[PDB]
Structures are given as C-alpha cells and as structure tokens.
Ligand binder design. Sequence first.
Ligand SMILES: [Co+2]
Length: 28
Amino acid sequence: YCSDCGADASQVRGGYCTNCGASADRIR
Ligand SMILES: [Co+2]
C-alpha cells in the first residue's frame, strides 16, 4: 500500500503512486 494515501500497491506506475504522487519508496 501507499503509506501516504493508502492506495493499493498495484496503483504505482512510473516511480510514483498514481493517486497521491508519492515517490516509489513510500510504498510499503
Ligand atoms: Co499514494
């Protein structure tokens, strides 16, 4: 999940969370 917004990890693309724009490393 994205620690910043809670989006499912499947929503990360291009090095960012596609919901909140968090950088990749915020995924946990
Ligand atoms: Co996010």
